[PDB]
């Protein structure tokens, strides 16, 4: 009666987070059009028309990022889908063989007075016991001599080997969720302004989220997730100059990123079966490569960050930006991709700037080369295939990274300068807002009343 | 007004208790092998506790009560308050250091004594 | 004598209503992935229905009844023509676009309004 | 004192027939395949037998009774000695020649009458 | 039982190339006493009277 009895109930909501593995789904229309094959998204087991969302009350909860397991499983699964998208396409060993030439004669006769290197050399037929003549062309940015025409090689086949990209793989990337199994949820709060951690007022709870686009760029990130209404900084440890520094901005800035010159392609075969594509020859003028940016609108939103960046660092301090500082070109430069090919922009056209506390376009200059070292990996090493006609992309300016300099206690009006190098920290800017966690069904409480015999 | 999924997990207790379905409705809702430890783990989690409940004396009953008295050395807030201003987040971590006591003094004192009583009852 | 499994599935609803034993019976009676990915998808059907089973107050119990009554909008046909001139692959076609208003309004009929009586005729 | 698991098996019928949830209790507890292979075979086991006992009329009694009665031509001792002096690893080989006969009839004896008395005794 | 390998190396290591570094066996330098083993003696007599019996 006025003693107590106990009663047990079944699926009541409670949650304490732990970790599991995921997966992923994403489509509703790019298996059927899929240039006939694609970096390895194949069944994946498409999506959902109309996702779940719910809306949470009195709840709060503790927020930290750079602690998050999510981004290490999109780190570990890339690298195992890129090197299985490249494996069972066709090797070549025989290709790193001496060889002696200069430079191509119009070389001389362009704004681009640079490197282009009309070489040749000899190399096996399908036949065993025949050699054949071919011509070609290598930028100097892949080749280097040994130390009479002085013989070069290609840059490290003296640490790895070297594998062609297969023919048909298109490389552009197409949107993906990633969702969790039973039994477990994923967490989003949707404030509009968060700076990094701590506790968020209002969540919310999605088997899975929205597309994101594994794009592979250092310095800028592009076709990247826009912000809210308002530009924000984040971080770990400012003034403490080890980490690197993101931020994120609303008002997205055009990009238009041209190669002039077609240069039509030949292909001869290795043999038996090593259909092998190499550079033909050029028709034409030659323009280098380079890219366009709205001029004011670049003055702009650089305002706009440094109003927003003032407040992490007094009122009364000076901000002057500069270019990249050195060692490896893979820190320095803007690379990225674009239409199966690879750039290197220089970037010096952008951080030249002071700051005082109180329709024009910059035609910035880029290169190309054509052995990539790809994911800070020694051990491997990948050969692109040039491709004919005129390559052209659009793309949306969102997010740069920045880093810090030496110096003094806060009076000496500190700077900023790119760099980075990293490739996580992409994904985990583009992954700020989730958290995975695990439910409990199971409780037991005390009742007032009995049970039936 | 269907609330959904985790809906009243910040409401109180009655409010929370009400609705029960809708946990259920959901907790069964190169790349093939990571889908399949997957689905393999869910089904996992999902019959582990089922005959765990199913021990108890409720086999698909969500909602059941049993025998066992409550030793007041456990709580000690009476009965109203519990069930008015504290939350089941509140409440688990409250009396985690419990339930190993709990579980098994729950389930030999009906389905011991109260099979073997069933035994004797329908005996004569 | 036993008709074997799918037996009667021509034939009409008493015929085949008294023989149900033997659907279950049957149920769950390089080259080494495709299996595996056979066996879990046979646990998965069959589990997943087990629950949706359960859930309506029907453990194992593989006939039973409920308290809902029929909205004779659903149908008109009275009593007797539909348990004597009519099979199941005639009947399921025909109350096709209905279920997801039956399966809802069943379940939280009985076991949200007949557990919580349970909580009040089991109190006092 | 808790005997632990597989504890009295040597023992005698009642001795053992007094303890028998931690058999339930220990029953769930490149090379990712062959652990994945287990736990899909353990999985499968304890599913089968299951709804083999959900059919028979006892979903998650551990211990139930039924309705068919001892046909004398199975075995002759009485009741006394068998509970007393034998263990069950002596039983189970003793009356292994039967069980194929005992499981069918079994399982319509209640639950084809005993579903059809309680659809005519529920009826009026 | 103890067992030791006295002359140790020095070692070098020459590429095949593309990636292939080869190791191999260098100079060696000092005395050479071939690889052998000690036992204890009386004790292995003792095991040996034992496994007899
Ligand atoms: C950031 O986001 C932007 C915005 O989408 C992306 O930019 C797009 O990138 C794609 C990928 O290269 C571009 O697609 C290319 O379009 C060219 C123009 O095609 C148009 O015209 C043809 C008819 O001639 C239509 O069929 C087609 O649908 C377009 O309307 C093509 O010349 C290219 O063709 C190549 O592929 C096709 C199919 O594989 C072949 O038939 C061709 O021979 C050739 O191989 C290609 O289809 C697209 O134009 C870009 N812009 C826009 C506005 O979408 C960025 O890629 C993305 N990422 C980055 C890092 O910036
Ligand atoms: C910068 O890095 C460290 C590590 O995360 C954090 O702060 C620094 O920690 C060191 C080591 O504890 C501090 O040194 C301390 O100095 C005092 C002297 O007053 C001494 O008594 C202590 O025992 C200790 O040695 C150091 O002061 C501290 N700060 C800096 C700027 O180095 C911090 O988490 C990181 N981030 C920031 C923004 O500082
Ligand atoms: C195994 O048994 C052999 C005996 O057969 C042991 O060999 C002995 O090892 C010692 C230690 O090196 C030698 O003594 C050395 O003599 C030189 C002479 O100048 C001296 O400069 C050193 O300081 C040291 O004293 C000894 O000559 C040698 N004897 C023989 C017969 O080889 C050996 O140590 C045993 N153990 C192992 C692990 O091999
Ligand atoms: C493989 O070839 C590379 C070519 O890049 C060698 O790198 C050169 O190393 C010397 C060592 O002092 C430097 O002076 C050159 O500047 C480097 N080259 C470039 C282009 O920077 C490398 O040493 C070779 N060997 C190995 C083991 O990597
Ligand atoms: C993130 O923004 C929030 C929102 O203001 C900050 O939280 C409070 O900020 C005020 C500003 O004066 C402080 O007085 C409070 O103490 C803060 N509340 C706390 C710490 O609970 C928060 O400080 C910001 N965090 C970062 C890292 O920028
Ligand atoms: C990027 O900006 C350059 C200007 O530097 C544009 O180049 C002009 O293109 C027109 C078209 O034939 C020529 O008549 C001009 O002489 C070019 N100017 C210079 C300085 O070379 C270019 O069109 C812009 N857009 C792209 C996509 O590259
Ligand atoms: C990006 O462009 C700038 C602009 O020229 C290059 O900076 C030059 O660097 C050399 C070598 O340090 C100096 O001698 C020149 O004086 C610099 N130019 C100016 C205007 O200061 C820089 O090298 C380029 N970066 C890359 C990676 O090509
Ligand atoms: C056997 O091991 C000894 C370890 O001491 C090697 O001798 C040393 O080699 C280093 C190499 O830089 C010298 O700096 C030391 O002075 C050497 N110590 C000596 C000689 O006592 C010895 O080289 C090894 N044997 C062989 C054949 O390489
Ligand atoms: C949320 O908290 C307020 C504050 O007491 C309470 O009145 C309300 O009922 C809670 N639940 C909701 C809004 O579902
Ligand atoms: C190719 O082989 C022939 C064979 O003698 C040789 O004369 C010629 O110099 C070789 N050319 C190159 C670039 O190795
Ligand atoms: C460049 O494009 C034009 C477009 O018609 C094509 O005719 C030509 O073959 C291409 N290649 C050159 C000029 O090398
Ligand atoms: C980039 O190209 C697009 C193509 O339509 C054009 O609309 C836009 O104005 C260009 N922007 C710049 C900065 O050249
Ligand atoms: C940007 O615009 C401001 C006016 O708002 C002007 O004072 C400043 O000089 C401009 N800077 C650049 C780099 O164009
Ligand atoms: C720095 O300037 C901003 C701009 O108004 C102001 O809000 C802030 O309070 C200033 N900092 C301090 C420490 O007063
Ligand atoms: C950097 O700024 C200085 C000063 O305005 C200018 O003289 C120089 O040309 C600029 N360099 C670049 C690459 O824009
Ligand atoms: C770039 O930003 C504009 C601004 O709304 C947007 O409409 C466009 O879709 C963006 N580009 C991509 C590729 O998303
Ligand atoms: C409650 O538990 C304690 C052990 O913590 C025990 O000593 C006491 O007798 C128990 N009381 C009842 C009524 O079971
Ligand atoms: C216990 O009863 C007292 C009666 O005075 C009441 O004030 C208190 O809130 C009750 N405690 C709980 C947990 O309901
Ligand atoms: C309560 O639980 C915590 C969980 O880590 C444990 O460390 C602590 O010793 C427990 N206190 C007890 C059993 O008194
Ligand atoms: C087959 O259908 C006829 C039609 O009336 C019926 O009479 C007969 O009993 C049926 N037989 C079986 C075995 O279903
Ligand atoms: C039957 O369903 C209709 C909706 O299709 C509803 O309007 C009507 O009230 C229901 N009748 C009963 C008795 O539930
Ligand atoms: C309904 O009852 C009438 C009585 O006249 C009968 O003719 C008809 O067959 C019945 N309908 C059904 C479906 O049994
Ligand atoms: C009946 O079901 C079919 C199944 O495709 C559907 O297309 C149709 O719209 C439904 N009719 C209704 C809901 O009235
Ligand atoms: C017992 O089984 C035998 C068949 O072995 C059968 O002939 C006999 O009638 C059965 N007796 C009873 C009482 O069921
Ligand atoms: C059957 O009853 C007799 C009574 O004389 C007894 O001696 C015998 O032990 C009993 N058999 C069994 C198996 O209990
Ligand atoms: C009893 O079981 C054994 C098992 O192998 C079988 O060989 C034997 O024929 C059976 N005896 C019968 C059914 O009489
Ligand atoms: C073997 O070497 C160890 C090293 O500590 C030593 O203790 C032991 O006595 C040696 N045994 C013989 C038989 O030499
Ligand atoms: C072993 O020791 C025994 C003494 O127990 C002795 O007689 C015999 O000769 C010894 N044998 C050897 C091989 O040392």
Sequence with gaps: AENLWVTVYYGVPVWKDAETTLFCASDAKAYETEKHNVWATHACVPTDPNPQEIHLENVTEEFNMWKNNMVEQMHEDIISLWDQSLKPCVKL?????????????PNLLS??????????????????????????????????????????????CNTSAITQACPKVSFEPIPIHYCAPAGFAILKCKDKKFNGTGPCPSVSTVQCTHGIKPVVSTQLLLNGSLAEEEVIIRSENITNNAKNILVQLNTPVQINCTRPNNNTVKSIRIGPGQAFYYFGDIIGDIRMAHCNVSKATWN??????????????????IIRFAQSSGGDLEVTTHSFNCGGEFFYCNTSGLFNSTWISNNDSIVLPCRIKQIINMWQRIGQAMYAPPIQGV?????????????????????????????????RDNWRSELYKYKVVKIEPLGVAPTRCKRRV | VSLGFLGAAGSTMGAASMT????????????????????????????????????????????CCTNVPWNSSWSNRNLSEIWD?????????????????????????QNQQEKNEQDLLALD
């Excluded at chain 1, 060993?93 to 004669?105: E, S």
């Excluded at chain 2, 869910?42 to 108890?56: F, K």
Aim: net charge positive; with cysteine.
């Design chain 1, 93 to 105: 060993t025989p290709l790193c063989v001496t060889l002696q030439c200069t430079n191509y004669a």
């Design chain 1, 300 to 317: 702009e939103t650089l305002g706009k960050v440094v109003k927003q960046l003032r407040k992490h660092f007094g009122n009364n301090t």
């Design chain 1, 111 to 156: 704004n681009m007075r640079g490197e282009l290197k009309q070489c040749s050399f000899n190399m096996t037929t399908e036949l065993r016991d025949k050699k054949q003549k071919v011509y070609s062309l290598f930028y100097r940015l892949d080749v280097v001599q040994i130390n009479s025409n002085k013989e070069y090689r290609l840059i490290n």
């Design chain 2, 20 to 63: 029960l379905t809708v946990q259920a409705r959901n907790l069964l809702s190169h790349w093939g092998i990571k889908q399949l430890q997957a689905r393999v783990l869910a089904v996992e989690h999902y019959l582990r506790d089922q005959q765990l409940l199913g021990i108890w004396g409720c086999s698909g009953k969500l909602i």
């Design chain 1, 391 to 423: 390559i052209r992309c659009v793309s949306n300016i969102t997010g740069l990274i920045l880093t810090r300099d030496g110096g003094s206690t806060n009076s000496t009006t500190e700077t900023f300068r790119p760099g980075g190098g990293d490739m």
């Design chain 2, 85 to 109: 201003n504290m939350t089941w987040l509140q409440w688990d971590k409250e009396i985690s250091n419990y339930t190993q006591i709990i579980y098994g003094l729950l389930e030999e004192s």
